[PDB]
Amino acid sequence: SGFRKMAFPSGKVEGCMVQVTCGTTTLNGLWLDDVVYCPRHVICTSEDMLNPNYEDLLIRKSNHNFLVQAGNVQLRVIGHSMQNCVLKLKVDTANPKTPKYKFVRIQPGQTFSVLACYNGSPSGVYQCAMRPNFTIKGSFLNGSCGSVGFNIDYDCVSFCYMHHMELPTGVHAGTDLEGNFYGPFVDRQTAQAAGTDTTITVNVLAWLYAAVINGDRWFLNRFTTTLNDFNLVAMKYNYEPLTQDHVDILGPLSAQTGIAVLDMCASLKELLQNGMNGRTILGSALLEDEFTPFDVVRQCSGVT
Amino acid sequence: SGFRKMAFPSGKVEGCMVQVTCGTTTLNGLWLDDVVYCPRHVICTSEDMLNPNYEDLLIRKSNHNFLVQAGNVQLRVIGHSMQNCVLKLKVDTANPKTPKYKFVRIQPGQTFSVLACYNGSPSGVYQCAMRPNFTIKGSFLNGSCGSVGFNIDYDCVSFCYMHHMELPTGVHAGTDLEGNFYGPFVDRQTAQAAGTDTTITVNVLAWLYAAVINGDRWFLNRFTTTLNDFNLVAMKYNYEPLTQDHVDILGPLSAQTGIAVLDMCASLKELLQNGMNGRTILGSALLEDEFTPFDVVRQCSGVT
Numbered sequence: 065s066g067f068r069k070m071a072f073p074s075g076k077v078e079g080c081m082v083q084v085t086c087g088t089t090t091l092n093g094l095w096l097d098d099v100v101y102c103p104r105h106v107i108c109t110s111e112d113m114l115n116p117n118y119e120d121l122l123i124r125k126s127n128h129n130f131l132v133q134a135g136n137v138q139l140r141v142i143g144h145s146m147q148n149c150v151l152k153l154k155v156d157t158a159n160p161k162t163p164k165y166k167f168v169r170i171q172p173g174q175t176f177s178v179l180a181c182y183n184g185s186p187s188g189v190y191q192c193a194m195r196p197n198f199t200i201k202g203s204f205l206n207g208s209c210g211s212v213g214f215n216i217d218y219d220c221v222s223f224c225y226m227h228h229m230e231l232p233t234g235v236h237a238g239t240d241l242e243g244n245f246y247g248p249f250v251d252r253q254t255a256q257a258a259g260t261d262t263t264i265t266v267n268v269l270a271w272l273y274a275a276v277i278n279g280d281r282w283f284l285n286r287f288t289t290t291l292n293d294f295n296l297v298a299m300k301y302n303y304e305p306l307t308q309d310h311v312d313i314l315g316p317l318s319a320q321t322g323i324a325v326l327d328m329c330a331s332l333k334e335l336l337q338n339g340m341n342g343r344t345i346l347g348s349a350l351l352e353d354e355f356t357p358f359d360v361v362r363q364c365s366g367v368t
Numbered sequence: 369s370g371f372r373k374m375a376f377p378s379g380k381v382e383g384c385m386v387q388v389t390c391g392t393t394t395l396n397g398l399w400l401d402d403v404v405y406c407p408r409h410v411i412c413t414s415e416d417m418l419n420p421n422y423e424d425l426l427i428r429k430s431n432h433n434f435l436v437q438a439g440n441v442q443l444r445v446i447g448h449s450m451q452n453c454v455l456k457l458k459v460d461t462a463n464p465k466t467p468k469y470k471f472v473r474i475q476p477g478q479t480f481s482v483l484a485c486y487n488g489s490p491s492g493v494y495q496c497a498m499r500p501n502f503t504i505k506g507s508f509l510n511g512s513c514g515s516v517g518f519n520i521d522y523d524c525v526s527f528c529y530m531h532h533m534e535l536p537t538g539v540h541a542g543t544d545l546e547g548n549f550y551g552p553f554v555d556r557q558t559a560q561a562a563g564t565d566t567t568i569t570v571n572v573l574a575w576l577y578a579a580v581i582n583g584d585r586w587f588l589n590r591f592t593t594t595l596n597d598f599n600l601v602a603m604k605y606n607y608e609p610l611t612q613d614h615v616d617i618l619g620p621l622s623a624q625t626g627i628a629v630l631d632m633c634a635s636l637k638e639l640l641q642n643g644m645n646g647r648t649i650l651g652s653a654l655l656e657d658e659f660t661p662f663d664v665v666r667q668c669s670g671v672t
């Protein structure tokens with residue numbers, strides 16, 4: 065029993081973290097096989113960052129300008145290319161600790177673990193979600209760029225995020241491992257405002273199911289609703305619309321608890337309209353939206 | 369910027385987790401040097417668990433009755449002893465991945481990371497605190513016993529917790545790595561009620577400092593207080609008393625933010641008396657008490 069905000073074990077990713085230095089800029093890289101992936105803004109002075117022309121800045125850089133250190137040993141860079149907003153540094157040595165891995169671009173609402181690193185050295189691990197506005201709410205200081213976000217399916221690490229940017233509002237933007245930003249963000253020190261940070265409805269429902277499974281039942285009400293009725297309320301409260309695809313995904317949590325998805329929707333509706341009245345659910349005084357349905361299944365069934 | 373509930377990187381501990389089986393009971397062990405540490409209740413049938421006599425149950429067990437598996441390879445048990453509520457299984461092979469490590473008994477209020485394991489296989493990592501009633505609020509299913517709690521000081525893992533028990537209320541009890549229970553709990557399936565789960569005052573203050581550092585300032589008030597005045601309010605709200613030792617520990621957070629510890633105490637006092645009024649601090653609608661002052665320093669300074 066008990067339900068915790070849980071990150072994947074970080075060991076497989078710890079073994080992939082290196083320090084990348086270009087001139088006076090040091091950040092983190094991800095070493096998979098004989099390639100080190102890092103944010104292309106490693107090539108920038110903070111001055112460059114105001115209006116960088118990355119192709120033009122890259123002409124001034126050779127293989128030997130990229131200093132890659134894995135622990136306290138230098139890797140030989142034998143090639144480099146720009147893919148979108150990441151640099152791929154070819155090194156002469158395959159990472160001996162390369163895990164099975166995939167590159168996956170996640171959708172808003174999906175959760176992942178971040179291994180926060182400074183100078184290629186891991187400091188901590190935490191669980192994030194891709195927000196509906198394609199930001200993440202991270203914990204990232206100067207030097208944390210190139211820290212990555214990941215999921216693990218048994219023995220295979222799916223890399224979904226690399227850290228690039230803090231917005232003036234202190235929320236975070238970054239790329240998939242093909243260098244493509246999530247959302248409309250760019251690796252430039254310019255005014256970039258995030259859209260509405262809406263609540264991930266399907267995730268709140270999953271967590272309400274988790275609460276029922278763990279004995280927190282006080283919010284279960286006598287009502288049901290429809291998707292259209294629920295969605296009118298959702299809109300009003302800046303919750304993402306719920307689709308039949310979301311209802312389908314929640315099906316196993318419905319089955320386990322014998323609470324129809326639309327019944328839990330009506331319980332959520334009442335919680336939005338009435339508030340918590342100073343009560344908690346799973347030790348939270350707000351509705352948690354950074355557990356996916358699968359996260360709830362995983363933690364409530366003990367997958368390794 | 370940003371402030372997250374952050375666990376230590378789990379890699380060093382992942383490398384120490386093994387499966388221990390005695391008869392039909394499988395749980396987790398911790399392999400350090402040539403010793404596997406596990407809960408002594410590995411020897412119990414659930415029937416035994418109602419009134420176990422551990423010395424008497426152990427007479428029926430030999431070295432070969434303890435099956436230790438590290439990944440998919442069996443370790444040879446050449447010795448076994450009971451220390452308090454843990455078994456120490458001597459194996460013929462030193463763990464090649466043994467990190468630098470210490471055994472530390474923590475005080476209530478101290479935080480640590482838990483690597484949740486099933487069948488010697490890590491499923492996730494989360495951040496806990498030793499509650500003032502010597503429980504922890506974990507996420508632990510059947511098979512998770514022998515999962516451990518730890519801190520890392522640079523390269524040295526300090527092991528502070530091993531999981532043993534879920535109380536009828538679904539909170540958790542376990543031991544230090546010398547087999548001594550935290551609090552008055554015993555490894556017996558009997559009625560064991562926890563005391564008052566009080567709020568770790570010094571931890572809430574630290575997190576309020578973290579909030580100021582990250583731009584959440586709305587709760588800063590025009591008041592100050594004294595330890596005695598604050599403590600009258602603390603008592604009323606089931607907050608732990610604040611000592612001059614706690615004030616001393618908060619000193620660096622005071623210095624960084626220029627907010628006197630007693631001023632932040634007066635801000636906390638008003639938050640207890642007035643509530644949050646539907647506002648959040650660092651994305652929480654309650655006062656978070658599972659960050660230590662050092663945790664705040666660590667995350668706000670980027671230690672690795």
Ligand SMILES: COC(=O)c1cccc(NS(C)(=O)=O)c1
Nearest residue numbers: 174313314316356357358359361
């Ligand atoms: C077991 O049913 C699920 O929760 C489930 C099924 C299939 C896929 C997922 N992935 S998710 C939570 O990101 O959308 C969850």
Ligand SMILES: COC(=O)c1cccc(NS(C)(=O)=O)c1
Nearest residue numbers: 478617618620660661662663665
């Ligand atoms: C830097 O000042 C601190 O926060 C500090 C100093 C010394 C020790 C600690 N350990 S603790 C938070 O567990 O009580 C924190």
